[PDB]
Structure 1
């Protein structure tokens, strides 16, 4: 009558076998809705910051990929002004065994290693390709401004 065994499986593994540097709690009203907090990756311009992300497991999931979006403003070539994430295991390369924790550390991996060269990148991309040094400092600036509380 409830959720597919798989969802229960993962959901329980999360609130049990936590991903390092990533917090993932269930919403108080939607069992397919999760409030995630990702710690800025070590050695990244986001290090020291905490970023809020929301994750939703669609009905037709695992078929359809989970929906994820940043809720904390971040300066990154693959995260837009509304927090939408350009990660391909989220659109093209998605398939059933990936689960949630593949997406999560992958997202953390994106922060650790930006992809300015991505076709659908930002505009932040432009500044990351041409003046990476300045882009990295601005990402740190935005971390100080939006991800320290």
Structure 2
């Protein structure tokens, strides 16, 4: 019945002390959903892009992890065609998750356990994969306001 203390107070600190380089604010209608904007890191294949994500706090949060999805299309080994992200300690929080997603953009080269098709292309034809990520950045993450 209403939001738990944990979400009310964490949302207040998230608005008062945002993650640098990351916009994150709760939805006006359902405060369990957050609209996130992450800038493509400079020097990454995503430079110039801005990437919109939806973050959702399940009823079990923080005993269960937030659910997160790119709403902007992105060519990345950890992100599928649905925008679902591959990457839980209830001692962590939203800002921890956002920091990890930002780091994914800064170092997109795939970790060895990944086996999906984009990870394999990035592993075997890295120069081509990077050019593809830049094209998708220009096509989907720019002129995207």
Q: CA deviation at 1:42?
A: 2.2
Provide the C-alpha distance between the structure 2 equivalents of 1:122 and 1:133, rounded to a whole number of angstroms: 18
Q: CA deviation at 1:13?
A: 1.4
Distance 1:137 1:14, change over 3 A: same
Q: 3-state DSSP class of the match of 1:15?
A: helix
Contact 1:36 / 1:53 at 8 angstroms: preserved in 2? Answer: yes
Q: CA deviation at 1:118?
A: 4.8
After superposition, the CA RMSD in angstroms is 1.4
Contact 2:109 / 2:123 at 8 angstroms: preserved in 1? Answer: no
Contact 2:77 / 2:114 at 8 angstroms: preserved in 1? Answer: no
TM-score by length of 2: 0.91
Provide the C-alpha distance between the structure 1 equivalents of 2:40 and 2:83, rounded to a whole number of angstroms: 15
Provide the C-alpha distance between the structure 2 equivalents of 1:17 and 1:121, rounded to a whole number of angstroms: 37
Distance 1:118 1:81, change over 3 A: farther
Provide the C-alpha distance between the structure 1 equivalents of 2:50 and 2:37, rounded to a whole number of angstroms: 6
Gapped regions of structure 2 (runs ≥ 5):
none
Does the alignment pair 1:35 with 2:28? no
Q: 3-state DSSP class of the match of 2:128?
A: helix
Q: In the TM superposition, what whole-angstrom CA distance separates every residue of 1:50-98 from its partner, at most 9, and x where no partner exists? A: 0010000011111110000000000000000010000xxxxxxx11121
Provide the C-alpha distance between the structure 2 equivalents of 1:31 and 1:73, rounded to a whole number of angstroms: 24
Q: CA deviation at 1:48?
A: 1.4
Does the alignment pair 1:114 with 2:81? no
Contact 1:79 / 1:122 at 8 angstroms: preserved in 2? Answer: no
Number of aligned residue pairs: 141
Contact 1:78 / 1:115 at 8 angstroms: preserved in 2? Answer: no
